[PDB]
Amino acid sequence: GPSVFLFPPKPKDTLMISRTPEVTCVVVDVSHEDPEVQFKWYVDGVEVHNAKTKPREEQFNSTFRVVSVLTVLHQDWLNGKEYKCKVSNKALPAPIEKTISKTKGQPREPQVYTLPPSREEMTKNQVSLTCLVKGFYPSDIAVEWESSGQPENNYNTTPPMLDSDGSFFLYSKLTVDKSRWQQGNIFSCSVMHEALHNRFTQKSLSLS
Amino acid sequence: GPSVFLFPPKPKDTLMISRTPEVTCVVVDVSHEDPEVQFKWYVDGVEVHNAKTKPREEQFNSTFRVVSVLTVLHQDWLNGKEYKCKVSNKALPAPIEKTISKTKGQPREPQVYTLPPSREEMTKNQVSLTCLVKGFYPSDIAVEWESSGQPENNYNTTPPMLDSDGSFFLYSKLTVDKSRWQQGNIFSCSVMHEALHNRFTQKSLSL
Amino acid sequence: GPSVFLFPPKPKDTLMISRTPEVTCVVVDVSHEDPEVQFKWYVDGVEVHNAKTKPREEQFNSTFRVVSVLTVLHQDWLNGKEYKCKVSNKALPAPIEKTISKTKGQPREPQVYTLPPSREEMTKNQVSLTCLVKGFYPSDIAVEWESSGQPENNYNTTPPMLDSDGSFFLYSKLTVDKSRWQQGNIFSCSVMHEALHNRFTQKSLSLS
């Protein structure tokens, strides 16, 4: 029978009110004999009607994929409210229900560090700048290499590896041509996260 | 039916002078009705028998996994010699051949960069010294913080991501108490790689 | 009857992978009645077939000299693996076997010191600079007077003479006309050795 997957909204969408966060319920392996899929949506057990079902799409295995989206309230998502998707399809023995909420775990304020390039790296054409974002939880975050609060041309961001502190860390590799760094630009790495003051922080960088 | 995968030697095997690299040919999904798998190995198309076929292994899907390995020489691997694995099995429609050599693409001498800790990082008890390794190609790499050209060890290593220069980069997160950085330790970092002098170069850092 | 000599590869060839190190088996005093010499080669007792026999050459004593060369692996030579040459000739009562490996003895990191010329030597046309390479063992080494890592015009290298520390030392006499030194050029003695990090170290020198 078909299977159902439920995706969270983008972190920024949950943190920026001028944005709309939504959860996405994806149903795969729906059969052609019974392609109709009913979606019912609930926020912490209360049915809401601002959810919408996306068009059904046939998959490589000759089954249908059916998706429903529920708009979620900023307050509901950031406070960790639970959003339930109910999926019904005749190729299912029982309706499938899936719940999602703000990515599980206690929020942690990201510690944003901007590691300068190696002194020996000035002999090379292009130097790397290194936004260490550590001590942040959940992975719902935005990490924002910048100059003086204005995002940068080129950063090659590592995965959220776990740091020496049990948080996620990543490096955003703000890789900059030698003149940019050597001249002492005030780069900055900003980071957007629920646990930050402003849900948004800015930690600068310059030849130092 | 069966599938064959041919793996290069471990990067440090190809890159550490003291090591002997070998290539490993893995065959999965060999059937039980015809479990016999023939491995023939070739170096630059010439069949060799210093290659060895590993034991057949039953997968949970009621198939067999069969593996053969061929030792490769430092200069041979680094000079791009081609090592070919020929796999035959009756559950295959035809024999499957795979060849492996130094990972194809322009080699680049790794630029080894003990990046200093962030000024912003001095607020914490511990700071990260990052041995950026950039400008290297292939990903066939080994990375190694150091001090005075001798190793350091609380380095994380990121993946060989792509760098802006069209190479791989990775960051080697040595992470250390703030005092070590502020005290002006002569750290270093080595990187072992085919394009390097002695395939191994070391770059130092200190405050 | 004939005699056999086995020579090691050049140190640099063993330390630079982009180089190929080889061992050379030399057979002298081979007779003219039986000039044919068979060479068999083994690496740590395992016969290899990437060895080659050089052309036979008649010596001053009216005997033949026959030579065989075996390419050696970087790993094999630097790890001290043993390479055996088997020599057969009818003018021999029994085959002659000779083994060679990385020059015998415990590796020691070369200490590279660049001694400036005498203060009184500026009164003379041309001053000497003194690359003291000490604490290095074995003699498999490359010693490299330079400027800033780029080899120099004129160093009169003094022998591997044993030092106060039981290593070989040598000077390399980077003799330089007075203006080069007096102006404070960053000369440099580098030194390549198995015991060095990178098998290769670089030391500056300047008027100091």
Numbering used by the authors:
A (entry chain B), C (entry chain D): 288 to 495
B (entry chain A): 288 to 494
The publication says:
However, in tomograms of IgG3 bound to antigenic liposomes, elevated platforms 22 ± 3.5 nm (SD, n = 100) above and parallel to the liposome surface were visible above the Fab domains. IgG3-Fc platforms are therefore an additional 11 nm further from the antigenic membrane than for IgG1, which is possible due to the long hinge of IgG3 adopting an extended conformation. These platforms were often observed above ordered, striated IgG3-Fab arrays; from a total of 1193 elevated platforms, 525 were above ordered, striated Fab domains, with the remainder above disordered density. To determine whether these platforms represented hexameric IgG3-Fc domains, we performed subtomogram averaging and 3D classification of all 1193 particles, which yielded a hexagonal Fc platform. This Fc geometry is in keeping with previous data of C1-bound IgG1 platforms, although these hexagonal Fc platforms have not been previously observed for non-mutated or antigen-bound antibodies in the absence of the C1 complex. Our data did not resolve the hinge regions and so, to yield a complete model of the IgG3 hexamers, we modelled the hinge as a semi-rigid helix which spanned the ~11 nm between the Fc-hexamer and Fab domains. The Fc platform was rotated to minimise the average hinge length between the respective Fc and Fab domains, yielding the complete hexameric IgG3 structure in Fig. 2b. The elevated platforms and divalent binding are therefore both enabled by the flexibility of IgG3-hinge region compared to IgG1. We observed that IgG3 formed Fc platforms ~22 nm ± 3.5 nm (SD, n = 100) above the liposome surface, with the hinge adopting an extended conformation. Our cryoEM model of hexameric IgG3 Fc platforms revealed the location of K326 on the periphery of the Fc domain, within the CH2 dimers.
